[PDB]
Design a protein around this ligand. Structure first.
Ligand SMILES: *[C@@H]1O[C@H](CO)[C@@H](O[C@@H]2O[C@H](CO)[C@@H](O[C@H]3O[C@H](CO)[C@@H](O)[C@H](O)[C@@H]3O)[C@H](O)[C@H]2NC(C)=O)[C@H](O)[C@H]1NC(C)=O
Ligand SMILES: *[C@@H]1O[C@H](CO)[C@@H](O[C@@H]2O[C@H](CO)[C@@H](O[C@H]3O[C@H](CO)[C@@H](O)[C@H](O)[C@@H]3O)[C@H](O)[C@H]2NC(C)=O)[C@H](O)[C@H]1NC(C)=O
Ligand SMILES: *[C@@H]1O[C@H](CO)[C@@H](O[C@@H]2O[C@H](CO)[C@@H](O[C@H]3O[C@H](CO)[C@@H](O)[C@H](O)[C@@H]3O)[C@H](O)[C@H]2NC(C)=O)[C@H](O)[C@H]1NC(C)=O
Ligand SMILES: *[C@@H]1O[C@H](CO[C@@H]2O[C@@H](C)[C@@H](O)[C@@H](O)[C@@H]2O)[C@@H](O[C@@H]2O[C@H](CO)[C@@H](O)[C@H](O)[C@H]2NC(C)=O)[C@H](O)[C@H]1NC(C)=O
Ligand SMILES: *[C@@H]1O[C@H](CO)[C@@H](O[C@@H]2O[C@H](CO)[C@@H](O)[C@H](O)[C@H]2NC(C)=O)[C@H](O)[C@H]1NC(C)=O
Ligand SMILES: CC(=O)N[C@@H]1[C@@H](O)[C@H](O)[C@@H](CO)O[C@H]1O
Ligand SMILES: *[C@@H]1O[C@H](CO)[C@@H](O)[C@H](O)[C@H]1NC(C)=O
Ligand SMILES: *[C@@H]1O[C@H](CO)[C@@H](O)[C@H](O)[C@H]1NC(C)=O
Ligand SMILES: *[C@@H]1O[C@H](CO)[C@@H](O)[C@H](O)[C@H]1NC(C)=O
Lengths: 314, 240, 40, 47
């Protein structure tokens, strides 16, 4: 949904503390206001992606303290008050798998802290298990939970007596179904690897960006101060301009990877906002859109830089 | 319903005649194109290490051998600026492509149809939508049924009458306190519970939270009115 | 008398809901609502 | 028939409502059940 924000300054990155370098940077023009604008256009968007996926409800909904759900044991996906964070047993696990630095690389914080993302999730979920679908299409109207589950079955072309004749089994399946995903998630890594695969590319792009500071481009060093401390101000520029034209190619590439991936991340966040709308705030009939099978309901879960949907299917 | 529709269209107009930033999503992309072309032009003034950024100022002061060393910098600065600008514009040309294919999908599903997708044709339950031309954009006026005044009711999953369980065919059972009615799910219009509103399956042992009430049969009183008229014909025909 | 303030942002209006295994809320009235959605 | 339709309220409100038969098919059955019963009373006049 998001990817780790960054911001990088031409001035710091091209010029480690040289005005001779900084006049030689100004020689190129608007490139550096433009590259401050490009990365700002990503940083203002990873917040936008978080808001279009989680802010689909304009109230915060709180669970009742009783577990009056007619058999369905959602405690694993509601909050655990015993934690210092208001997260679930499943959402804690999603953070168990997945100041400012030198050289002017930086990592800006998200607008929504993870605690607030988890709050929107707990509210979308408290809507889901009490309000029917109605907290999407209007005000929140409470319905008995298993009578919501009856509407689900009547939605997938099963006659609702099949729920009331088997509600015990349907719950003893469902409590096992939310139990089996725990045991998978407790031990398997790759079940969340998709978020780790995004984080690895931003890290591999930053590793490259900092590695490219260490490059000669034909200049007598990769280092700026080790060129100033030797060559005097005029003959030095033949060196410093080669470190500029190198380092500037390095930024122009790194920003091109970050914009193209920001589009891949947007495409994945807008797909998640569609999953959140059709799978969490409703009951879609798109076949296999909310997991493989006939869909009943889905529960959002908060994870590092993503949203996770626990889809329930007959 | 027409007055709520007319009120809402009158408000949509009154807002579009008063708020600035509603069309902001279209303003934003026009501002990007204005800003990105302005940036492509501001690059031209850059000297790039050449004696001057006016290329006529190379060609008016230098001969070929030394003019080359200046002009080649200007080619380098400008060509890079265009490889930058066209790649930035390509990445944007997909931001528009995706916004267009989303708008064509919404045009088709919300204007040429009525979608049972949540939140895809505005907020609420979708009724219909209307397209408006905007410069470089489309506006969908999405028209939606939203429930407005609500009250609590008691409810039950089934009614038990002959030890057989009765369930709604559509709708839900509602008690105002004294009685039991069956109502359509999204608007309170209670009906007497009957064999037409309710279907039957199995027995009152299995349904958790089942409740007791009679289910009306329209046949028994009507065919009893014929049995009272039958009674007269029998009593009459004692007399001959 | 004006000032710039700064604060932890709310997620909007609070709502604990009156759920029970035998209570339903049903609408008696409704709004036909028109909204404008704008796309490039 | 009454099975192809459903009912609510009265003709004051529905703009452009039209007059017709709705032909409840229970009744052209139960009339033919009363006329068979009436044959049984007419047969019962004979003994
Ligand atoms: C639950 O809904 C019931 C249905 O509307 C309602 O009972 C109904 O109350 C009306 C009066 O408002 C009764 O109407 C009769 O009132 C007297 C009776 O002597 C007559 O003079 C009138 O002409 C008329 O026939 C209805 O008979 C009655 N309906 C039924 C099915 O019994 C309840 O009051 C509602 N209860 C709650 C708790 O809201
Ligand atoms: C729903 O309605 C049912 C029928 O009105 C009702 O069941 C009836 O419950 C009574 C009281 O428990 C039973 O009374 C009998 O109790 C024992 C046997 O259990 C006998 O020794 C007694 O002599 C007496 O006959 C009825 O037998 C029983 N009737 C039927 C046909 O089931 C339910 O209890 C009602 N439930 C609710 C929640 O309203
Ligand atoms: C559909 O059928 C209705 C009858 O079931 C019919 O309503 C009847 O219309 C007649 C003719 O206009 C009325 O006749 C009386 O008109 C006034 C009183 O309204 C008297 O001064 C006259 O002397 C005359 O008796 C009926 O009173 C009226 N009945 C009812 C129940 O409304 C509708 O007009 C028909 N509608 C269509 C569109 O065909
Ligand atoms: C739906 O009912 C709840 C609570 O149940 C009612 O409690 C009594 C007051 C009495 O009316 C009983 O017959 C009902 O069973 C209502 O919840 C309260 O709402 C107010 C604000 O309006 C709030 O201050 C209270 O704290 C709430 N109490 C609880 C326990 O939630 C609710 O307002 C009713 N809503 C509708 C639409 O009917
Ligand atoms: C919902 O499921 C959880 C997880 O199985 C239940 O938690 C267990 O509860 C028993 C009895 O309190 C304890 O002995 C176990 O140690 C608990 N295990 C864990 C992992 O917490 C929980 O009781 C169930 N809740 C409801 C409302 O039924
Ligand atoms: C005299 C007369 O009408 N007899 C009829 C008889 O023919 C018929 O089989 C029977 C059956 O209803 O009813 C009587
Ligand atoms: C609903 O819950 C209460 C306990 O909170 C209980 O008294 C009542 O019998 C329950 N009814 C059903 C149908 O579960
Ligand atoms: C009884 O039968 C006679 C004919 O024998 C008829 O005139 C009369 O209307 C009948 N009355 C009733 C109440 O059935
Ligand atoms: C339908 O339109 C005609 C005019 O063309 C008008 O006379 C008539 O009253 C209208 N009917 C309804 C039900 O509004």
């Amino acid at each position: 949904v998001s990817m780790t924000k960054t911001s990088v300054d031409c001035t710091m990155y091209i010029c480690g503390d040289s005005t001779e370098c900084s006049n030689l940077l100004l020689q190129y023009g608007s490139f550096c206001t433009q590259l401050n604008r490009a990365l700002t256009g990503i940083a203002v968007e990873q917040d936008k992606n978080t808001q279009e996926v989680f802010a689909q409800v304009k109230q915060i909904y709180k669970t009742p303290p009783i577990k009056d759900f007619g058999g369905f044991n959602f405690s694993q996906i509601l909050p655990d008050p015993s934690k210092p964070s208001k997260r679930s047993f499943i959402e804690d696990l999603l953070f168990n798998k997945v100041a400012q630095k030198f050289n002017g690389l930086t990592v800006l914080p998200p607008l929504l802290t993870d605690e607030m993302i988890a709050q929107y999730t707990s509210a979308l979920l408290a809507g889901t298990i009490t309000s029917g679908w109605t907290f999407g299409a209007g005000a929140a109207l409470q319905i008995p939970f298993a009578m919501q589950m009856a509407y689900r079955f009547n939605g997938i072309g099963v006659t609702q007596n099949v729920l009331y004749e088997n509600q015990k089994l349907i719950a003893n399946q469902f409590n096992s179904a939310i139990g089996k995903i725990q045991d998978s998630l407790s031990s398997t890594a790759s079940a969340l690897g998709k978020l780790q695969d995004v984080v690895n590319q931003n890290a591999q792009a930053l590793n490259t960006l900092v590695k490219q500071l260490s490059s000669n481009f034909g200049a007598i060093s990769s280092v700026l101060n080790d060129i100033l401390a030797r060559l005097d101000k005029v003959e030095a520029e033949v060196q410093i301009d080669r470190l500029i034209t190198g380092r500037l190619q390095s930024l122009q590439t790194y920003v091109t990877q970050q914009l193209i991936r920001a589009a891949e991340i947007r495409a994945s966040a807008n797909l998640a906002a569609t999953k959140m709308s059709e799978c969490v705030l409703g009951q879609s009939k798109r076949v296999d859109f909310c997991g493989k099978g006939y869909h009943l309901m889905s529960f959002p879960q908060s994870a590092p830089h993503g949203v996770v949907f626990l889809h329930v299917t007959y | 319903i027409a007055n709520q529709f007319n009120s809402a269209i009158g408000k949509i107009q009154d807002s579009l005649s008063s708020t600035a930033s509603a069309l902001g999503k279209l303003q934003d992309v026009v501002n990007q194109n204005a800003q990105a072309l302005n940036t492509l032009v501001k690059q031209l003034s850059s000297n790039f290490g050449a004696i001057s950024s006016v290329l006529n100022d190379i060609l008016a002061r230098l001969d070929k051998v030394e003019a080359e060393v200046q002009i080649d910098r200007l080619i380098t600065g400008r060509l890079q600026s265009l490889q930058t600008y066209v790649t930035q514009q390509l990445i944007r040309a997909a931001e528009i492509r995706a916004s267009a294919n989303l708008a064509a999908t919404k045009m088709s599903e919300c204007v040429l149809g009525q979608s049972k997708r949540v939140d895809f044709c505005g907020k609420g339950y979708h009724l219909m939508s209307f397209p408006q031309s905007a410069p470089h954009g489309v506006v969908f006026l999405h028209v939606t049924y939203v429930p407005a005044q609500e009250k609590n009711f008691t409810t039950a999953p089934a009614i038990c009458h002959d030890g057989k369980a009765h369930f709604p065919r559509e709708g839900v059972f509602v008690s105002n306190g004294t009685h039991w009615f069956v109502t359509q799910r999204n608007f309170y219009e209670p009906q007497i519970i009957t064999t037409h509103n309710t279907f039957v399956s199995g027995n009152c042992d299995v349904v958790i939270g089942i409740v007791n009430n009679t289910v009306y049969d329209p046949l028994q009183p009507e065919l009893d009115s014929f049995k009272e008229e039958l009674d007269k014909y029998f009593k009459n025909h004692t007399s001959p | 008398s004006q000032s710039i303030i700064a604060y932890t942002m709310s997620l909007g209006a609070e709502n604990s809901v009156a759920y029970s295994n035998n209570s339903i809320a049903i609408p008696i009235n409704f709004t036909i609502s028109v909204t404008t959605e704008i796309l490039p």
